[model samples]
Target: ASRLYTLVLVLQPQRVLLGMKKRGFGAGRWNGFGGKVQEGETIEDGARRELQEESGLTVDALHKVGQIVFEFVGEPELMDVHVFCTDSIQGTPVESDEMRPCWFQLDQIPFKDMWPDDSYWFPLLLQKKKFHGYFKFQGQDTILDYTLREVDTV
Candidate 1:
């Protein structure tokens, strides 16, 4: 079995957004919403738990947005990430021990503070479009990649 992770995006009212706490490996970074898969938990279960654990929100209509594989030099492990999305959700977001949520406008998203690849497909996600991609990273630098489609033409 491969190590798997999930990420969720909860759009706030107006154009504001929230960024999760980045501690340990994710310290000082802004990421969608998510975490590692727990023992014996289904992907959806893991997604739901992680979302609630990190964001204090409950989402019921999560659909698969896409997936990405990450490989790093020196480390002999591969990370398989499943990205999920839901236009419908419940509960008000509150700060947690692991996550400190903050809101930002759609155009004001701190791309420089998040994983480099996020800026690539995250916009597509906002457009309600599906995507799949692969990224190879050595530390925090993206060295190789592929995307299912271009999210937006610039």
Candidate 2:
């Protein structure tokens, strides 16, 4: 079975909320708030829980913006990510053990400091257009290959 995960991005006035990974599989990279979908929780519930847990922002209305599958060269379990974005949330972002939160202006997205795969789908996300992607990573820094496209539905 594919491993389920959730990712949420908060887009505000010409800015986006991003997290600096503190510890875990992606420690050191800047990315969205999300993690493994736990038992008894829906995908949306998991996204809400992770965002608040990692960044202290609570948002109920999350729009499903994309779907992605990440494959590691030697890994068997696929990372099935349910991507979401929201324009509304409560509370200023606060840091946690899992991540350090920050707001970056749209132009300063730090794409190079984040996952390489992000640069592909983010353009669609920024446009508020739905998308889907598949990526194969050699380790953590380089993208072996990928397929991305704008879709009417995700």
Candidate 3:
């Protein structure tokens, strides 16, 4: 089976937007735009398309920030996460079938609506500092974890 790759992106949230999936994995949560990479599509291409498709926004000048590989024994597939950060992009945030854009304060992230593990690392990523971490979770609860040592370069 083909492995599933996911991209996590950040953008300035808008007052109101649409197209978010209201059921399944995300349910009624506001999430950064991303999806499984299609056949013959590069991860970067998939990221751009997902951003556009879900938020009606166009992103450029993205930088690779981190990578995560998750595996569950007895599970049929592994999941890979590619985390990237972009400072600037084109197009206004708009509502779509995949998302409803809402502005969240730096400290007011809707964690209740997101996976429990997100809160642990998203703040670090938003701070422009890169980190590498792995989490083992059963359902929505984290069962075990590890993080690489952090180093700063002047």
Ranking by lDDT: 2, 1, 3
Candidate 3 TM-score to native? 0.78
Provide the TM-score for each candidate, comma-separated.
0.85, 0.97, 0.78
The residue-by-residue lDDT of candidate 3 on 1-154, one tens digit each, is: 3364656566344321223356566466556667788898888787777777777878666676666555554566656776666657687777776577665666666777766666776767676677665666555445465454333520
Candidate lDDT values, in order: 0.74, 0.93, 0.62
Total residue pair clashes for candidate 3 = 11
Name the regions of candidate 2 deviating beyond 4 angstroms.
none
Q: Give the clashing residue pairs of candidate 1, or none.
A: 17-103, 17-104, 22-27
> Which segments of model 3 are wrong by more than 4 Å?
1-4, 11-21, 72-74, 142-154
Model 1 compared with the native: what TM-score? 0.85
Which of 2 and 3 is the better model by lDDT?
A: 2
User: How well does model 2 score by local distance difference test?
Assistant: 0.93
Model 1 weakest 10-residue run by lDDT? 145-154
Q: Give the range where candidate 2 is weakest over 10 consecutive residues by summed lDDT.
A: 112-121
lDDT score, candidate 1, position 67: 78
